[PDB]
Design a protein around this ligand. Structure first.
Ligand SMILES: [Zn+2]
Ligand SMILES: [Zn+2]
Ligand SMILES: [Zn+2]
Ligand SMILES: [Zn+2]
Ligand SMILES: [Zn+2]
Ligand SMILES: [Zn+2]
Ligand SMILES: [Zn+2]
Lengths: 138, 149, 79
C-alpha cells in the first residue's frame, strides 16, 4: 500500500495521492497532501495554525520506521489538537492533555483513532480528555 | 571559515538529557522515538518533505550548554542521505560516498544561543523518491561553569 | 609549542587497542575502522578533512603505517 485510498486532498483535489496524508484535528473531514501542506494551502475555514495530524501509507510507514517492528495499525505520532504541539506518544499525549489543557473543552477531531486504521477519521468529542481516558487507553 | 580545534569533541561530553522533535519530524514520529533512534544504531529517521526538514533540539538540563553535534548518515541509503545541512546560519554540504559521521562544533556565540533550544535544517536528499534519511544524531556540550556562562 | 612535545598514541598503543578519541581523515581515504589519534589529526593530517569518529577502543593507524610517514612518532622541534 503506497496510496491513501479513499482520501483526497482538499486543496489540489487529488485522490489516492502518494505521500503523507494530513488530517485537520479541528477542521471537519478536510485533508491535505504533503505538497499542498508544505505550500501553506488555506481555505475560508482552515488555517495553517490548525493542529495537524500526519498519517502515512504502508510503503511510507516502512520507509519512515525502517528497522523497527511498529506497524501501520500502531500509530506513534499524535498532535495536540488544541495546542499545535506534535509528536506525542499515547501516554505522552494524554499526559499533556491532562496537565496543560485540563479545562479546555473546545471541539476537536482526536488524532489517534483518526490516524488509526479502521477507526473514525473524523470522530468529534467535546471532551478529548474523556476520549483519552475512556476509550483511548492502552 | 571558522577553524575549530580538532580535539573539540574531546573537551565535550555526550549528552543523554536531550529531546529531539520539530513539526517536520513530529508529524511522523514522537519525541521519545526520535531520541531513541538518534541515540541508537541499526535504525534511522526519515522525512519525505521536499527541500528539507527542521529538527528542534531541546536541552532539559539547565546546568549544561550545547557545544557541538555529530550526525551519522549513510548506513541505510547514501542516495536518501541529505545533500547538505544548516544551523545557526551556517550551511555545510554532505558529499557522501558511504556511511560516516559529520561533525559541527558550535562557536561561543552559537553555544550561547543554544542554551535551551536550537533548530537544525536538513536539505532534501538526491533520492528520486524525495526521502531525507539521517541515522543517528549525538549532541555534545559542557557544564555552565566549564563553559564560563 | 605544547603540541610539538606531544607524541602519537601509537608508540604506546602499538597494534593493541586502548580507549581513546579517534577521528576519520577523509582526505586520506581512511574511514570506518581506520583513523588517527588527536596528535596525528592535528599534525600528521593538518588542514585535512577530518571528522571525529568516536571515543572508544582503537589504535592509531597513522602511527601503524610501516612507511614511517607518521610525523608524530618522534618529538618535533618548533619552527
Ligand atoms: Zn494537495
Ligand atoms: Zn482546519
Ligand atoms: Zn497543547
Ligand atoms: Zn478518538
Ligand atoms: Zn597518532
Ligand atoms: Zn590525511
Ligand atoms: Zn601520525
Amino acid at each position: 500500500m503506497s496510496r491513501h485510498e479513499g482520501v483526497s486532498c482538499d486543496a489540489c483535489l487529488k485522490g489516492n495521492f502518494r505521500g503523507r496524508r494530513y488530517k485537520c484535528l479541528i477542521c471537519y473531514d478536510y485533508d491535505l497532501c504533503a505538497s499542498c501542506y508544505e505550500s501553506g494551502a488555506t481555505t475560508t475555514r482552515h488555517t495553517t495554525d490548525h493542529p495537524m495530524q500526519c498519517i502515512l501509507t504502508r510503503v511510507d510507514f516502512d520507509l519512515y520506521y525502517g528497522g523497527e517492528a511498529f506497524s501501520v495499525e500502531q500509530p506513534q505520532s499524535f498532535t495536540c489538537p488544541y495546542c499545535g504541539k506534535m509528536g506525542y506518544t499515547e501516554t505522552s499525549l494524554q499526559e499533556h492533555v491532562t496537565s496543560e489543557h485540563a479545562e479546555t473543552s473546545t471541539e476537536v477531531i482526536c488524532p489517534i483513532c483518526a490516524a488509526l486504521p479502521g477507526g473514525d477519521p473524523n470522530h468529534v468529542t467535546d471532551d478529548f480528555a474523556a476520549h483519552l481516558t475512556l476509550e483511548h487507553r492502552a | 571559515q571558522v577553524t575549530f580545534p580538532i580535539d573539540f569533541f574531546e573537551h565535550n561530553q555526550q549528552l543523554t538529557d536531550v529531546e529531539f522533535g520539530g513539526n517536520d519530524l513530529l508529524q511522523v514520529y514522537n519525541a521519545q522515538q526520535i531520541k531513541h533512534r538518534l541515540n541508537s544504531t541499526g535504525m534511522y529517521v526519515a522525512n519525505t518533505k521536499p527541500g528539507g526538514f527542521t529538527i528542534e533540539i531541546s536541552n532539559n538540563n539547565s546546568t549544561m550548554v550545547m557545544t557541538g553535534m555529530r550526525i551519522q548518515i549513510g548506513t541505510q541509503a547514501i542516495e536518501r542521505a541529505p545533500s547538505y545541512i544548516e544551523i545557526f546560519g551556517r550551511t555545510m554540504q554532505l558529499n557522501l560516498s558511504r556511511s560516516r559521521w559529520f561533525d559541527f562544533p558550535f562557536t561561543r556565540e552559537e553555544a550561547l544561543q543554544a542554551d535551551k533550544k536550537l533548530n537544525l535544517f536538513i536539505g532534501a536528499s538526491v533520492d528520486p523518491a524525495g526521502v531525507t534519511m539521517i541515522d543517528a544524531v549525538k549532541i555534545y556540550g559542557k557544564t555552565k561553569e566549564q563553559f564560563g556562562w | 609549542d605544547s603540541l610539538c612535545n606531544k607524541l602519537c598514541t601509537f608508540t604506546i598503543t602499538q597494534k593493541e587497542f586502548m580507549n581513546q578519541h579517534w577521528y576519520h581523515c577523509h582526505t586520506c581515504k581512511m574511514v570506518d575502522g581506520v583513523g588517527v589519534c588527536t596528535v596525528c589529526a592535528k599534525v600528521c593530517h593538518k588542514d585535512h578533512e577530518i571528522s571525529y569518529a568516536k571515543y572508544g577502543s582503537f589504535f592509531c593507524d597513522c602511527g601503524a603505517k610501516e612507511d614511517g610517514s607518521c610525523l608524530a612518532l618522534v618529538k618535533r622541534t618548533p619552527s
